[PDB]
Amino acid sequence: TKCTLKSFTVEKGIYQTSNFRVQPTESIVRFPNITNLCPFGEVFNATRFASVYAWNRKRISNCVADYSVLYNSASFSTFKCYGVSPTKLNDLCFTNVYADSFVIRGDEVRQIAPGQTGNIADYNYKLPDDFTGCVIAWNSNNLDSKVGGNYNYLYRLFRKSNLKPFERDISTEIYQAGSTPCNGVKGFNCYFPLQSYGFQPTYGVGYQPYRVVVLSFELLHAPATVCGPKKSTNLVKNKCVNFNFNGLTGTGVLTESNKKFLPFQQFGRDIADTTDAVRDPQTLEILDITPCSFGGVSVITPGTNTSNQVAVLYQGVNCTEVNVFQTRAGCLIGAEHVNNSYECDIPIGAGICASYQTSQSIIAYTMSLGVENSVAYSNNSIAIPTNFTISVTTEILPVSMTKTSVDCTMYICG
Amino acid sequence: AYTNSFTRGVYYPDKVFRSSVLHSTQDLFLPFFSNVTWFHNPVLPFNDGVYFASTEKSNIIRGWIFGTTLDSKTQSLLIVNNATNVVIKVCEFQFCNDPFLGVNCTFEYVSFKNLREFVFKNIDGYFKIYSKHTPINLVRGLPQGFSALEPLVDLPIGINITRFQTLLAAYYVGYLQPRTFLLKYNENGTITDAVDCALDPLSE
Amino acid sequence: DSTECSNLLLQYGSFCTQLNRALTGIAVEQDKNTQEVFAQVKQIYKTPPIKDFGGFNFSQILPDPSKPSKRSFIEDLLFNKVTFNGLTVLPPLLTDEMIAQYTSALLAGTITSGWTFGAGAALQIPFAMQMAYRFNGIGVTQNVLYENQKLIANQFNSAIGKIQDSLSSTASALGKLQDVVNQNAQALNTLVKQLSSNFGAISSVLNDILSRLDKVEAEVQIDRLITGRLQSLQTYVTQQLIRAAEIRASANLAATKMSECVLGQSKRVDFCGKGYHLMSFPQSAPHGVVFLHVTYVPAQEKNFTTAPAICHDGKAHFPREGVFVSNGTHWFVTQRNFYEPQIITTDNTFVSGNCDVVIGIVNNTVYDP
Amino acid sequence: QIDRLITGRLQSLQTYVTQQLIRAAEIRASANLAATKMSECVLGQSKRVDFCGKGYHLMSFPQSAPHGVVFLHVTYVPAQEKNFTTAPAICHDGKAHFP
Amino acid sequence: DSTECSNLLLQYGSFCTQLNRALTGIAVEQDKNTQEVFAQVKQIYKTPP
Ligand SMILES: *[C@@H]1O[C@H](CO)[C@@H](O)[C@H](O)[C@H]1NC(C)=O
Ligand SMILES: *[C@@H]1O[C@H](CO)[C@@H](O)[C@H](O)[C@H]1NC(C)=O
Ligand SMILES: *[C@@H]1O[C@H](CO)[C@@H](O)[C@H](O)[C@H]1NC(C)=O
Ligand SMILES: *[C@@H]1O[C@H](CO)[C@@H](O)[C@H](O)[C@H]1NC(C)=O
Ligand SMILES: *[C@@H]1O[C@H](CO)[C@@H](O)[C@H](O)[C@H]1NC(C)=O
Ligand SMILES: *[C@@H]1O[C@H](CO)[C@@H](O)[C@H](O)[C@H]1NC(C)=O
Ligand SMILES: *[C@@H]1O[C@H](CO)[C@@H](O)[C@H](O)[C@H]1NC(C)=O
Ligand SMILES: *[C@@H]1O[C@H](CO)[C@@H](O)[C@H](O)[C@H]1NC(C)=O
Ligand SMILES: *[C@@H]1O[C@H](CO)[C@@H](O)[C@H](O)[C@H]1NC(C)=O
């Protein structure tokens, strides 16, 4: 009160000083429940993979990704992610996602990094200098290697220019290395642009074959058919909470409700656009969202020159939600409820008033309108004054304000 | 040829419950008492958006095509009902200029006394569809009394549209305009009457 | 309740303190207006079981304790015919059950004791004799009441019956009170709907702005919402300060009609309803007061010949309180506001000079009793 | 930076002049009432109930006060009531007399 | 009558409409004032010749 009125001494009255507000007890986050996870794991379990000179863009769309199940896991012979912290990948959204994918030798997996040099990067599949995405690789010497060498896996090494980012070139056509025209056949000055790995089970761990997915991304003007994963939480009723349903955020009290929602209706509004009910996407009940209780805190005080005793009114708040005493003005605290009515000393509302009285304390009471009087009326009785009193009655009326003039230029610009 | 639309062709503009209340809203809607085109197929412009209705239960109206080319030079929106389910695709089809019954690809989706009514619009990379079905007592010409059309799907198709065509007793075609409507909601959360604010001075 | 916004709103200083202080001025004034109209009696007078008022029937305007709260039949008709974003509505100090005790007290004083309860302690007087004084106050001689008391009571009882039929069948008189409810509802609806307006910002929702943008851009985008929403409150508070001055002019008028029409018999022409004022009765209504003004309206005119004075023994006679009239053959003096002819006498009249001076004097015998 | 301060200081000043105009209309309504009490209570004798204080009005005296006026309303208040039987008329030679 | 300006003014919401409504309140009240002063007579009384 003293701070609200900017004074160390406060005279008798009722003063509004701040607002009370019921606090959020927890957060509720009802996305649609976790469904249609992107099929990255189905690609990781595929029976075979592309030769790297002829790598495959396996499409991912219309699904929710999760990279956290990946970056937490030791389940790969190599794992990398780029452009952002792995934690940030689960916030991303794209028109499409891809498993840009191939077989390579183990020593070449480290070439797959943003803008970096290497035979795979510069001639087979190039990352941009600030690439956001992940590289996932696992040993396949049990399937991709063969006795006498498996020659079906090859990488490009010789070309007239290095790849631009995501540039692709599957051509097996002869590399001409001199003046001799090659006529579509191998020979002197006329060499193969590819090198085969020739994979064998006896080769050392860096020359063994590895199956690879590069998680690789595309946002166009078309909608983001892929995003990182939705959260989920439990749900609870008759308590103030922070909440989200889909993307409908708020702070409120969730309650059971009878609003006759049609199947497609997500939420309901009042006359003033106030959203006040929702359909829970994780269990199809209808919840009425009541506001979290708030109201003006008023402090009821005698003159501080007489006592530091005070009482508090929480305007419109039930005492269940804040001596203590409920009134139709709201919950009243620190005042005694007295059944004898009196003239109104300090007003409160809806017939209640308060005062500081006898040892003394604040009391609150229903106010008294005046003394009751049965007038002695009947069809033949009259009363006549036998005397009089002259009375002098003061009445005070204001007539003038203080005459003020302001120089607006000196006030505004000094 | 043309016929009066009366109060037809109003749909839920947002997926929201409203109770015993009037709400004023601006979007593409079929104007009240508009001259809708009447048919017994041609290729038609899409304009801002389409209302379609027919007297049907035989599935001779198999569905529609929407696009720019309507042909295999680029992606084209195909809607077909096979009398078991609806199937929808956006591929570069090269099917007939006038099909009839025997009696790259970037997206795919799977779902007379009767009057069947529908609304279509495309916005920013999503395709919106709304529909309703009702009995009618009248022979031909649309019912004067009100009923609302309910949202089906919000298909993330990415493509734009400029034309459409029907796939083979009457069918009716209307075009939406950017309009303000006052929509009347009943106690049970449903639209039940409306005012087209640009129709006449009383409506205004 | 967004902390990012609240730090910016501190840069505007005292504006929120003076907006709350202005609306607190409005709020106290509504209780003081209600106090000045109804609370004009120091004592809660009440009416005896012997309802014996000369044939007048006040049962439609007095309380009946069988009703929901102590309202009269007509106060129940009046109570039927009138009908959260940091905004709060406060209760009045006096409840409708307390206003109904004051209108009951004012009415019980008025019936049992006339104007006397406004001047001092209530003095009882029989109701037919109070109406005799109120007839005498409009210049009609009091015998014109007593010789017509059953007629006057039946016309009054019939007229109160018509007030019930009127209030049961049309709302249009209460358009004044309904307009005062509608304006406050429309102002609050408009104040709430302005939360949805962009004011040139990227969005109307604070979390939406904060989520999309660099903090320094978001601050510049939020200062638009703060400017628009602060201009929205200053618009509303200015409308309420003007609307409270309009209502206060009507509360001062109602407090004056309480004092002058109910607690008295004010002679101010067409202040307390049309016709000559006899008395009026207050009834409570939602956010207002209703006065049932009871008035004497003259009827059934007759044309008469008339003269300013009459000659006698050369003396010119003038009427002492009445007016001279003739039925065509004989001359009489009547009171002015009701035809009651008397023979002209040396004590119905006074003399001033002789027949020479007055324009239009006439000749007839003044009787000397 | 100055256009932000001009905007704020001007809005501060417009809000003040707006509320001083409304407060001046409130004080004019009070000065019209005071001029009316001067004319009707001091210069006259009012039969308007409660206008010149409680009781039947006799006269009033104006006294000045800073920014206002004070009226000392002198009123007759009736006191010590006896109560009596009464009648509207009295019957003599078969004729009704009224006071 | 600029469209480019009028589309910006809509973003201020009810600030335009409530001023047209306020000045309409002023305007109708002038006829109420003139009625209450002069229309106190129920008939057009006329002096004799
Ligand atoms: C997922 O949500 C749907 C719709 O609310 C519900 O029917 C289903 O039981 C939920 N499934 C699980 C596993 O929580
Ligand atoms: C406080 O109380 C004392 C008691 O003697 C009194 O003299 C004084 O006028 C009061 N008010 C202030 C402002 O001190
Ligand atoms: C306050 O809360 C309690 C909770 O049980 C409820 O019974 C009561 O009706 C509420 N209102 C009042 C005025 O007490
Ligand atoms: C006051 O009155 C209430 C009923 O209105 C009663 O319950 C309560 O016991 C009373 N208290 C005292 C101290 O008389
Ligand atoms: C006078 O009034 C008193 C109080 O009601 C009553 O007791 C008394 O009988 C009355 N006397 C007469 C003569 O009216
Ligand atoms: C009238 O009242 C006064 C006091 O106001 C008293 O002195 C006087 O004696 C009284 N006269 C009668 C006749 O009662
Ligand atoms: C347009 O509408 C009116 C009223 O529905 C109708 O009379 C008229 O024939 C229609 N004209 C055309 C060209 O459709
Ligand atoms: C609203 O819904 C209830 C559900 O029991 C139904 O009985 C009622 O008939 C419906 N109201 C209307 C007007 O259709
Ligand atoms: C009085 O006399 C005139 C004579 O022309 C006549 O018109 C009028 O109807 C008569 N009655 C009244 C009530 O004026």
Ligand SMILES: *[C@@H]1O[C@H](CO)[C@@H](O)[C@H](O)[C@H]1NC(C)=O
């Ligand atoms: C006028 O009045 C007297 C007494 O009432 C009566 O004798 C006379 O006949 C009346 N004249 C007319 C014309 O009515």
Ligand SMILES: *[C@@H]1O[C@H](CO)[C@@H](O)[C@H](O)[C@H]1NC(C)=O
């Ligand atoms: C009364 O009026 C008529 C004209 O209307 C006139 O002739 C007559 O002289 C007037 N009476 C007197 C007393 O002059």
Ligand SMILES: *[C@@H]1O[C@H](CO)[C@@H](O)[C@H](O)[C@H]1NC(C)=O
């Ligand atoms: C009244 O009587 C006198 C004579 O006493 C006469 O001169 C005069 O003309 C008479 N006036 C009228 C209006 O008859």
